């Protein structure tokens, strides 16, 4: 048996298996077993803005941006939706190792302002960084332009 | 109650299925959508550029 708990930003995050925050007095929670079919829920649009944005050319604070703020370059607060918490319901340690996989599906989708697609490999989450020493062309290559 | 029967297709998670699920937030109203220029309504619209 497990318990998936959705923790909105600003809510108390659990720190252990028997944490007092697991009472889920207000936060939504789901109890389910492994032998049952996988659980699923529907999720609304919770952003303060009018839409999610995957690119944010700017900084999130009015600071001086000396060096430390550069680690917040592109950090959009409008995309941080919360925290996901999981535990095995019990007082003592369980008897089996477990793995959880989260799958996502979109519906009622609207889009704006298309941009060119990605070319190189990914390196970090929420960062367009790429390996500068190993740069590769978009497609395949041939030997001469007059021969197939 | 009402007698039913189960067809041999239960308990499977199909990725491309369109189904109904229980909402997590009762009585939730999202932020209003303002007008943003440059909306795409079909992948074929930008296949001719």
């Amino acid at each position: 048996l497990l318990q998936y708990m959705f923790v909105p930003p600003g809510a108390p995050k659990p720190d252990s298996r028997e944490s007092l925050a697991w009472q889920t007095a207000t936060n939504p929670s789901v109890f389910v077993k492994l032998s049952d079919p996988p659980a699923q829920v529907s999720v609304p649009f919770m952003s303060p803005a009018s839409a999610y944005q995957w690119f944010y050319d700017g900084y999130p604070t009015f600071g001086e941006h000396k060096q430390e703020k550069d680690l917040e370059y592109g950090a959009c607060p409008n995309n941080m939706m919360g925290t996901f918490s999981v535990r095995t319901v019990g007082t003592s340690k369980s008897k089996y190792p477990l793995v959880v996989r989260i799958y996502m599906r979109m519906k009622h989708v609207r889009a704006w302002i298309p941009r060119p697609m990605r070319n190189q490999n990914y390196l970090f989450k929420a960062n367009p960084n790429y390996a500068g020493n190993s740069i590769k062309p978009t497609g395949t290559s041939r030997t001469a332009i007059t021969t197939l | 109650g009402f007698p039913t029967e189960l067809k041999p297709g239960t308990n499977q998670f199909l990725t491309t299925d369109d189904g109904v699920s229980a909402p997590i937030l009762p009585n939730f109203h999202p932020t209003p959508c303002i007008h943003i220029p440059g909306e795409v309504r079909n992948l074929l619209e930008l296949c001719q550029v």
């Binding site: 609304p44 009622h108 | 189904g19 109904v20 229980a22 309504r41």
Partner: peptide, 30 residues
């Protein structure tokens, strides 16, 4: 759309409306 709950965002995707505006990106000339 088929719905069984009191919330509109728990329904199915449904069938959209087939409309295109190819001139927005291809011919933006004044």
């Amino acid at each position: 759309t088929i719905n069984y709950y009191k919330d509109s965002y728990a329904a199915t995707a449904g069938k959209q409306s087939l409309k295109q505006d190819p001139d927005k990106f291809a011919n933006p000339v004044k």
